[PDB]
Nucleic acid binder design. Structure first.
Ligand SMILES: [Ca+2]
Ligand SMILES: [Ca+2]
Length: 296
DNA sequence: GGTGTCTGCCTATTCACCGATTTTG
DNA sequence: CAAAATCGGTGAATAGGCAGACACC
């Protein structure tokens, strides 16, 4: 019930969020309410993860995000110390670290209770401007000053495989590809491991090829949006390098079940039963019940 | 009677996921 | 030939967010 600290950090870099909110109290101008919060949104299927986090930090409350999503939110200021203490001993790796540093800075402003002053609000506004989506339209109208939006870029290395397990449990992918040969009935099995991330962490993505000794970064795109995908398709790399890593460092959530099914198919290929008409039908049945196909 | 804490509810997109074709040893 | 590399997607679980009730200093 108490997830490993480095697995938790890796998952946080994938799903976590450090939020600084600045709003008007009772729709009154020149009177701003400021508050900090940490939150992680997951599908209802992985609500157990959020509860495991809730047992590790002993803070936060889980509520419904939507009809298919729950979210763990830490809104108590005193409880935010638990979050800060954690990420000081197990630091973030992605560009979210920059958000955390800005998050901690706002914490100090609020801890000194300077957020109840004019100059304190002006400081938090400048902090929020570099956090996440930055200042909204209404906030930008209230503070038309040329505030710096940019932040110092984060360039860190993977601390350990325990972090990687948490990060992969969040953004990894274990897929089975049935390359159906056209003009025939024969189908070949290819295993597919993937880790997707925005282009803003390109440096960290490229390090995956070295840290795992395999795979290649694929620059993918949708409309005008772009991201990267670390992909391993060679069975030797998957069976000898990829799989043993996540056998050592266990995954969390429903994706663990996909990995277990993923290894079950790997064993069949390892025994060359994937070429068997019987073994392929078995693979076809396993594939149908993993990932998006999994309904139970 | 102000501020902090909590929750219902929302939107844009960064993901996870997908089948298939072409290249290579 | 079978595997590996490569292509070309896209629905949605995300990653942040908006607004206000209200317990409490
Ligand atoms: Ca992410
Ligand atoms: Ca995820």
């Amino acid at each position: 019930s108490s997830i490993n600290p480095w697995i938790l950090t890796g998952f946080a870099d994938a799903e976590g969020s450090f939020i600084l909110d600045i709003r008007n109290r009772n729709n009154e101008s020149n009177r701003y309410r400021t508050s900090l919060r940490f939150q992680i949104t997951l599908h209802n299927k992985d609500k157990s993860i959020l509860e495991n986090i809730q047992s590790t930090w002993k803070v936060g409350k889980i509520t419904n995000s939507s009809d298919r999503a729950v979210m763990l939110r830490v809104t108590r200021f005193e409880d935010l110390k638990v979050i800060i203490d954690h990420f000081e001993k197990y630091p973030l790796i992605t560009q979210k670290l920059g958000d955390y540093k800005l998050f901690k800075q706002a914490f100090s402003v609020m801890e000194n209770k300077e957020h109840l002053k004019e100059n304190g609000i002006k400081e938090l506004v400048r902090i929020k401007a570099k956090m996440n989506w930055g200042l909204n339209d209404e906030l930008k109208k209230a503070f038309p000053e040329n505030i710096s939006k940019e932040r110092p870029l984060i360039n860190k290395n993977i601390p350990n495989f325990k972090w990687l397990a948490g990060f992969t449990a969040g953004e990894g992918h274990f897929g089975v590809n049935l390359k159906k040969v056209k003009g025939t009935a024969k189908v070949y099995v290819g295993l597919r491991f993937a880790i997707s991330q925005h282009i803003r962490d390109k440096n960290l993505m490229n390090s995956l090829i070295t840290y795992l000794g395999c795979g290649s970064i694929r620059e993918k795109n949708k409309s005008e949006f772009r991201w990267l995908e670390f992909e391993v398709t060679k069975f030797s790399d998957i069976n000898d390098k990829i799989i043993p890593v996540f056998q050592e460092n266990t995954l969390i959530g429903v994706k663990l079940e996909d990995f277990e099914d993923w290894c079950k198919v790997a064993k069949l290929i390892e025994e060359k039963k994937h070429l068997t008409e019987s073994g392929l039908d078995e693979i076809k049945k396993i594939k149908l019940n993993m990932n998006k196909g999994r309904v139970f």
